[PDB]
């Protein structure tokens, strides 16, 4: 493994350099919303993002040390979570709105344009507000996103499951290293670490609730992800 041998700073650099780009939507103002154009907009966007996410995952330390079968499984489980945490991160500086794309900034009300969504919409907003309150750092964000990729499907001998746990521990060491640099006390480091990881349960929750409405206008890549 390359992964194990990395210092905390080299871990951060690898993740930062591996960041996918922020894509644009097709949104044409004027339309005023169909409110089922909007799902087309979001689906087309998510579909293009998935392509970048797949190539992003390859650059996450330890991910290429896994079998193709396991790589597929981890992405099938985590892809919506990963899309969601990316969304709330770039929405941090936009109180009360979600920045789906630089040209697609939406509020709660335009959420209602789809029957289910407001509920997930409100939770995404609350998550973004939480990140803003904690003043989440970019270095912390890339760590959290990588954790989601590796952890969400690790509970679905070989056993690469242990290998993933080693890398997960390494990311934990990295998070702590970051907080200790920011002038946080040991108590504060542990507390913040806990605070960040607890948000991941809410992101799992949002993904699940989102996945439900889906199982009730998709691309061929998305249709596969929805096993």
């Amino acid at each position: 493994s390359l992964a194990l041998s990395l210092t905390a700073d080299q871990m951060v650099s690898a993740l930062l350099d591996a960041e996918p780009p922020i894509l644009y939507s097709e949104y044409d103002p004027t339309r005023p919303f169909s409110e089922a154009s909007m799902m087309g907009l979001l689906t087309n966007l998510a579909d293009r993002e998935l392509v970048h996410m797949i190539n992003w995952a390859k650059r996450v330390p330890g991910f290429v040390d896994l079998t193709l079968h396991d790589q597929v499984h981890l992405l099938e489980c985590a892809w919506l979570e990963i899309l969601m945490i990316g969304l709330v991160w770039r929405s941090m500086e936009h109180p009360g709105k979600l920045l789906f794309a630089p040209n697609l900034l939406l509020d709660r009300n335009q959420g209602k344009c789809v029957e289910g969504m407001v509920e997930i919409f409100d939770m995404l907003l609350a998550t973004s507000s939480r990140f803003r309150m904690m003043n989440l750092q970019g270095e912390e964000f890339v760590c959290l996103k990588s954790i989601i990729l590796l952890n969400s499907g690790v509970y679905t001998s070989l056993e690469e499951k242990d290998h993933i746990h080693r890398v997960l521990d390494k990311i934990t060491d990295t998070l702590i290293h970051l907080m200790a640099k920011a002038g946080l006390t040991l108590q504060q480091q542990h507390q913040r670490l806990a605070q960040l990881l607890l948000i991941l349960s809410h992101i799992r929750h949002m993904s699940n609730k989102g996945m439900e409405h889906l199982y009730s206008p998709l691309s061929d890549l998305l249709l596969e992800m929805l096993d």
């Binding site: 797949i54 390859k58 193709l68 790589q71 597929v72 992405l75 099938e76 890549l221 596969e224």
Partner: peptide, 9 residues
């Protein structure tokens, strides 16, 4: 499986 394909390139 498109996912497996894009993962192999």
């Amino acid at each position: 499986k498109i996912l497996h394909r894009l993962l192999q390139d």
